[PDB]
Structure formats: structure tokens, C-alpha cells
Amino acid sequence: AMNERTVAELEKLLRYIAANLKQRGREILTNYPITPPQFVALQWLLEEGDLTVGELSNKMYLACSTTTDLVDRMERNGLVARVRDEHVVRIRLLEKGERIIEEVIEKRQRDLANVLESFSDEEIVVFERCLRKLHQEMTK
């Protein structure tokens, strides 16, 4: 009962929006000593706390081998440490890693504030409402 002309428009929009956001993200990260998958990894640790490599890889949709090499690079560069339970080894965001990602996120926020400056108060509030519903339906 869904309208295919509209769904086709929406699919294209979402795709070109995500492609543009990806590139803005890239451009922003040129001024930071991390790579895009390190950004993703670090942001997961910031948002979730200590994660095992298994937990991290499930969040990033990577194989364990891939996630371990990534964690290894970040640990080598002092962005994260490996920490075993006192009671299992988890990855913990170090201060150096946290400082960088907080800075990247703030720059991402400023960048978006510039894109959004032509939305009115009402369009921003509706827009957020739409995204919140989209995100919720997409994550089950």
C-alpha cells in the first residue's frame, strides 16, 4: 500500500544525504590524527564505555580479526588501553583518545549547525521528530 514514486525519492535522498555526510566527516578528519574506522571505534567507546573486541566488532559490523588489528593500532598510538576484569579483556578509552573524538564531534556539530541555519525553529523541531522516528523504526 506504499507509493513507489515516493519511496524511490526517499531512497535516493537518504543515499545522497549519507554520501554527503560521509564526505563532510572525511574532510573534518583530515585535521585529526585518527582514521575513519578509529573515529567509529572511539565514538562507540565514548558512548558505551569499556567494550570487549567481540562487543566492539558487533557494533561496527566487522570480523574479529579486523577489529583486533584496529584496536592494536589505537593501543599502539595511546588512544585506548586493554583492561582485564578483576573478577575477559575490555578496550578502554584513554584520555588522549577521548580528547580527540570529543573535538571531532564538536566540529561535526558546528558543521551541522551551519547546514541547519536556514531551517526555522519549527522546521528544526519537526525535522528532529522525523529523524527520531526514522532511527527508531530502523533499529527495530
Q: Residue 29 touches which of Na ion, a copy of itself, none (CB < 5 to 8 A by kind)?
A: Na ion
**Reduced to 3 DSSP states, what percent helix, strand and coil does the chain have, rounded to the nearest 5?**
75, 10, 20
To Na ion, the closest distance from the beta carbon of 132 in angstroms equals: 31
Q: Residue 96 touches which of Na ion, a copy of itself, none (CB < 5 to 8 A by kind)?
A: none
Q: Residue 14 touches which of a copy of itself, Na ion, none (CB < 5 to 8 A by kind)?
A: a copy of itself
Query: What is the C-alpha separation between 24 and 9, in angstroms, rounded?
Result: 22
To a copy of itself, the closest distance from the beta carbon of 27 in angstroms equals: 9
- For residue 132, the SS3 value is helix
For the chain, the maximum distance between any two Cα atoms, rounded to a whole number of angstroms, is 57
Indicate the helix (H) or strand (E) that contains 80.
Answer: strand 80-84
First to last CA, the chain: 21
To a copy of itself, the closest distance from the beta carbon of 97 in angstroms equals: 18
Among 6, 20, 29, 68, binds Na ion (CB under 5 A): 29
To a copy of itself, the closest distance from the beta carbon of 11 in angstroms equals: 5
